[PDB]
Amino acid sequence: IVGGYTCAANSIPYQVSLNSGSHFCGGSLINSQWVVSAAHCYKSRIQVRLGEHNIDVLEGNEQFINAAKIITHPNFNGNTLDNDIMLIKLSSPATLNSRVATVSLPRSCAAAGTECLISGWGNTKSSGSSYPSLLQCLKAPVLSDSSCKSSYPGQITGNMICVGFLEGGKDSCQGDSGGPVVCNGQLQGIVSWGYGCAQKNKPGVYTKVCNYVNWIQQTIAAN
Ligand SMILES: [Ca+2]
């Protein structure tokens, strides 16, 4: 997260870290056994870390649970990042409490202008790199489809939304992928891609979660 703030401890209780030796992606807890993330975050071995604030220090509220099932969207396109969504089934259910909690799926798509919260442990610099210990937070609005397509001509499918600021300076970045965009208590976006980070007229591009509610519910019910 570039240009954000350090979140208060466990104030984003659905935020998880995907770890394969080190933190490499975010994700969101949507029921006690299932995490949603980005398909391009796929690895064949994944430990999900819940209840994290400082990812470099054991603080006492963590739960480390291995991924048992790892299911990418069947129409994921690795060239365009279309359908950039993935479901992880935990090998045992997380214990839900005030610091480890689920986030609701969207009841409808978010309108342009809707204010959201983006979070993660990704890069905090738009030039160079700095990876933080503490979870970072950013308030940002959903952008119109026409604005998003103008920012990225010929790249924004009907399964993508832009969230952020055309003036740049505030954005998600590498290491945030798979993490949440939550608006009015609903997971509307998954950190997916962009051109650089916090660049002018290049807001972050996010998987449009409201298109996948049916796929998510059916996959969970069937597995
Ligand atoms: Ca920790």
Swiss-Prot record:
Signal peptide: none annotated. Ca(2+) binds at residues 52, 54, 57, 62. Pfam families: Trypsin. It comes from the Eukaryota. Coiled coil: none annotated. InterPro entries: Peptidase_S1_PA, Peptidase_S1_PA_chymotrypsin, Peptidase_S1A, Serine_Proteases_S1, Trypsin_dom, TRYPSIN_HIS, TRYPSIN_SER. The record marks 171 as: Required for specificity. GO terms for biological process: digestion; proteolysis. Its cofactor is Ca(2+). GO terms for molecular function: metal ion binding; serine-type endopeptidase activity. It catalyses: Preferential cleavage: Arg-|-Xaa, Lys-|-Xaa. Binds 1 Ca(2+) ion per subunit. Disulfide bonds join 7-137, 25-41, 109-210, 116-183, 148-162, 173-197. Its EC number is 3.4.21.4. The keyword Disulfide bond applies. Transmembrane segments: none annotated. GO terms for cellular component: extracellular space. Residues 1-221 form the Peptidase S1 domain. It is found in: Secreted, Extracellular space. Keywords: Calcium, Digestion, Disulfide bond, Hydrolase, Metal-binding, Protease, Secreted, Serine protease, Zymogen. The active site is at 40 (charge relay system), 84 (charge relay system), 177 (charge relay system). It is an enzyme of class 3 (hydrolase). Belongs to the peptidase S1 family. This is Trypsin. The lineage of its organism: Eukaryota, Metazoa, Chordata, Craniata, Vertebrata.
